[PDB]
Design an enzyme around this catalytic site. Structure first.
Site, PDB file in Angstrom:
ATOM      1  N   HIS C  17      12.795  27.325   6.284  1.00 19.84           N
ATOM      2  CA  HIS C  17      13.709  28.168   6.798  1.00 19.84           C
ATOM      3  C   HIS C  17      13.642  29.525   5.640  1.00 19.84           C
ATOM      4  O   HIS C  17      13.657  30.720   6.534  1.00 19.84           O
ATOM      5  CB  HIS C  17      15.276  27.803   6.590  1.00 19.84           C
ATOM      6  N   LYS C  41      26.340  16.686  15.595  1.00 19.49           N
ATOM      7  CA  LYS C  41      26.107  15.811  14.825  1.00 19.49           C
ATOM      8  C   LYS C  41      26.721  15.933  13.553  1.00 19.49           C
ATOM      9  O   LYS C  41      26.577  17.221  12.902  1.00 19.49           O
ATOM     10  CB  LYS C  41      24.525  15.709  14.421  1.00 19.49           C
ATOM     11  N   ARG C  90       7.588  26.032  15.413  1.00 17.65           N
ATOM     12  CA  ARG C  90       6.675  24.924  14.543  1.00 17.65           C
ATOM     13  C   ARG C  90       5.680  24.330  15.537  1.00 17.65           C
ATOM     14  O   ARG C  90       4.422  24.186  15.031  1.00 17.65           O
ATOM     15  CB  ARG C  90       7.436  23.716  13.766  1.00 17.65           C
ATOM     16  N   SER C 128      14.609  19.906   8.453  1.00 13.80           N
ATOM     17  CA  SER C 128      15.787  19.207   7.581  1.00 13.80           C
ATOM     18  C   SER C 128      16.035  17.770   7.987  1.00 13.80           C
ATOM     19  O   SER C 128      16.300  17.031   6.963  1.00 13.80           O
ATOM     20  CB  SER C 128      16.991  20.008   8.228  1.00 13.80           C
TER      21      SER C 128
END
Ligand SMILES: c1ccc(Cn2cnc3ncccc32)cc1
Ligand SMILES: c1ccc(Cn2cnc3ncccc32)cc1
Ligand SMILES: c1ccc(Cn2cnc3ncccc32)cc1
Ligand SMILES: c1ccc(Cn2cnc3ncccc32)cc1
Ligand SMILES: c1ccc(Cn2cnc3ncccc32)cc1
Ligand SMILES: c1ccc(Cn2cnc3ncccc32)cc1
Lengths: 159, 159, 159, 159, 159, 159
Positions: C17, C41, C90, C128
């Site tokens: 990040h 979540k 990514r 993460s």
């Protein structure tokens, strides 16, 4: 003695290929780095040139043997007494062709196990094609190739 | 002044390319639409033809400059004083090559940021190759190309 | 004078990040690092913790503003007068969702343009989620996090 | 004398898992089939049941040892003196996660090499998840499981 | 009468193609197996050879008609009074091109519905290109082709 | 006289689902739009609501029958004497699961053929999941839904 073959075009052999063959020598007793003639790919370097480049680039690895072949790779593996066939796995598009090739090799030689190794993140976005393309445009490719290969590629492109 | 380069083969420039360059001009002060010679791709249109087609197709956009290049794209970006390199992102197979090219461009020019823009859903399933293939078979491609490009492609295919 | 938003849950903020937001600060005048308040979540770190960690980890970047938000990301971007939406790319798997998200964001706020940035190879295989899973299971994640985040994560896992 | 680990939840062990572990036993001296003790998703079969089922289903393979583990898979591999980590590759979707996992495993334990094996075409489109879902919804899954597993699954679903 | 067209290069027709056309005849009243001239692909077999091979390989299927074409496939479908266009769906890389082609065919002939069928797991990792490559290296391809096709391919490669 | 089933959770039915079922009604005599009764994820709309919404949204299609089912989709298809299983294909990510599902469905009921249909570009980047998430977070989803569904969704979110 466990014998593995690492077949490919290696036109030319890159640091990504050195990474894979080094990982293979840490796992298997003897590794045959097998360079396919691949005339349909119209390679930049002759088979003789590719074999000499790979021999020099892998001379520091005691259990590597570099050979050239024009045979069906499953027959070449059988004839080298190999029971493992190594292929490097870089990205998604590579994976699709790899599964076709491995399922075909399994049909031709069921006792030959195809195993895939993953290169360092450092070499995960390069290929012989990409390095040649940059070099054709005179871009610096020293970071991606063994010293002897970089010299040969610079010389090749200087006519 | 933020300067961006949008490099590609543009053989020929399509509505998908116009969409991307329009989005780029809304984000950056000056956009260089850079047409690569790309002889290895054996393009249908000469570089001179591709530059003229793109100049006419982008004339309505005040901050677009069309140029041709045969240099390494990272060197051409440095030489255009560009700090952004735009590429359109259409599908999965495109993404893989885009990451290789961007990681190579980052190695060659770290201060040049590769940014990806997404075209309209309207142009998300077309390419210069697909439009040429339909046109070769005399199919209607008027919907996918600027008017001047459609005329040039029809004329090119009429010998 | 471009205003860009970089939204996410940042639970916790990683070096991946930090890489993306640093790249965004080099090309846009003002970057809002936007932290989603109530993710579906239940996050490991509360919104207060996530904002404080991101502030300290980006304090060296003069044109970053860390802000929490609870609305739809397009509604917040509109209220902040942002015209650019930063997304980190990514791998292939993320790209599929990114296309759905970006076309939905364009339907909701056409004046907001999605821009896709590529992280360093160093952070191209982390998330993460993976970092938390590894840390919860007693794995070393120091390399992937800013120091303040590494300290807060050790504290959270101790209790 | 190579020691390899083949980790997973094996909830329950399928013919796809039997295929991969059989291939691993043909190339490595000792294979530890490692069963994750406390998966985040509450498993259908308890750890005791999963270990007993895998033991009976692999009893014919002389160089397989079935063991439960609760630590991070790299911590267990290190304690077991394994230098090879077996992973089964089925399709593209798994490959993306496999890359993230393997790069994380290499960061955690560089002396552990990930090796990717390909299952038979027969098991290339199955998973313990799909098998359970089909069986729970009154579908025939006999073909995908070892006989002892088929018997235990019928018993679990009856109550 | 529901009429479907199954277009392709079929150079040569494989067991994977036979599988797809057989599934198509069980679904639709009449199936036109349409062999494209495809000169840009530089096919191994002439169009006349490919049509004769496919006619012989599909003679056991009463509702199959084999024809050759050089036209735009949407125009050929209209001219065959077809309202369904069948394509086999093998892998991810195939899917991307298939969506481009189907969205283009829909633009050209909206009432022509593109439908995709999935081959047996047996033929899910083969292609005409892969079978020709193995055959060029004298590998056994009897398992992948109809008898008449295998004979023609062996004869073709024996000069 | 072909009977086709088009199964799903339809929570709620979207314009993407209307597009696929409309295409299916143009090629098959009878289409059963089959609504899964007890999905593992607790649906936003009850089965009664999902069936009523789908009935009203497809009332203009003479050969569609909306039916709820609680068995495995293959068991229901078999009981309904369906020989065709309609699946909508949007992108690569869905395709991977679709292959697993279709090979499992072929194992369970070989006489049922999976047929993959492609939605309009307009609905190629949406899902009931994304629509619900956007609507729950106060985003405009009117364009993606039949009017009756838009009215029911506003009512559900108000309370
Ligand atoms: C890498 C890839 C391909 C080759 C050509 N080739 C040789 N034997 C083969 N067997 C199956 C398929 C291709 C084959 C060579 C190196
Ligand atoms: C688009 C794509 C490629 C090119 C050829 N090319 C030029 N410089 C390059 N640098 C790296 C890789 C390819 C390059 C041109 C346009
Ligand atoms: C990071 C993670 C989740 C969110 C939730 N969220 C907000 N706007 C959205 N639009 C579409 C889908 C999800 C959205 C936001 C940031
Ligand atoms: C199978 C399934 C899950 C696990 C949990 N797990 C253990 N080590 C891990 N490293 C990275 C991510 C997850 C990990 C283990 C086996
Ligand atoms: C398979 C694939 C392509 C072809 C060439 N081709 C013919 N009409 C076409 N229309 C659109 C695109 C390609 C076309 C032939 C068989
Ligand atoms: C839509 C969503 C889920 C379902 C559950 N379900 C029914 N048969 C199945 N076969 C394999 C896997 C899941 C299945 C059905 C429709």
């Amino acid at each position: 003695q466990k014998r593995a073959i690492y077949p490919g075009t290696f036109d030319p052999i890159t640091n990504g290929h050195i990474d894979i063959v080094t990982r293979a020598t840490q796992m298997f007793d003897h590794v045959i780095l097998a360079i396919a003639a691949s005339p349909s790919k119209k390679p930049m370097f002759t088979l003789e040139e590719r074999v000499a480049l790979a021999q020099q680039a892998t001379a520091h690895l005691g259990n590597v043997e570099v050979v050239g072949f024009s045979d069906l790779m499953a027959n070449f593996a059988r004839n080298q007494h190999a029971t493992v066939l190594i292929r490097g796995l870089r990205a998604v598009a590579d994976f699709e062709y790899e599964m076709q090739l491995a399922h075909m090799n399994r049909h031709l030689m069921p006792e030959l196990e195809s195993v895939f190794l993953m290169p360092s993140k450092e070499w995960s976005f390069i290929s012989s094609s990409l390095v040649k393309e940059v070099a054709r445009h005179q871009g610096d490719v020293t970071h991606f190739l063994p010293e002897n290969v970089h010299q040969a590629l610079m010389a090749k492109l200087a006519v």
